[PDB]
């Protein structure tokens, strides 16, 4: 008895809506945008 | 590299009330510091002595820093 589709599915959804959010917590080079001191 | 952001409490509030505090210390700390070291230096503590004959000093007179004496 493994997973279910519907389970599955979510999982599935979850886990790439995760790794979207993963890569979305990188940074461009150009940050960080530090004051002149 | 890889950089990742670092999700932190927002830190400006905290630092600049220790920087507030700190400015507001030290612009009346120096000059008391300076004046209290001049008083030191310049005008100087006080010198025990018996007493004369016929003198009856004031209060004041009967301690030794300027500070207290005033």
């Given amino acids: 008895s493994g997973y279910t ?5 979510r999982l599935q959804q979850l886990r790439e809506l995760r790794r979207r959010w993963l890569k ?3 940074l461009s080079p150009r940050e ?6 | 590299g890889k950089r990742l952001f670092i999700i ?3 830190g400006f509030y905290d630092k600049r009330f220790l920087k507030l505090l700190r400015f507001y210390i030290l612009l009346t ?6 004046g209290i070291t001049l ?11 018996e007493i004369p004959e016929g ?5 004041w007179e009967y301690f030794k820093h300027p500070i207290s004496r005033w």
């Fill in chain 2, 55 to 59: 003198y009856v000093p004031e209060h």
């Fill in chain 2, 29 to 34: 700390g120096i000059p008391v510091v300076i």
């Fill in chain 1, 24 to 26: 979305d917590q990188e």
């Fill in chain 2, 8 to 10: 932190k409490p927002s």
């Fill in chain 2, 39 to 49: 008083i030191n230096v310049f005008i100087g503590e006080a010198e025990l002595a």
């Fill in chain 1, 5 to 9: 589709p519907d389970e599955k599915l």
């Fill in chain 1, 32 to 37: 960080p945008v530090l004051p002149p001191r």
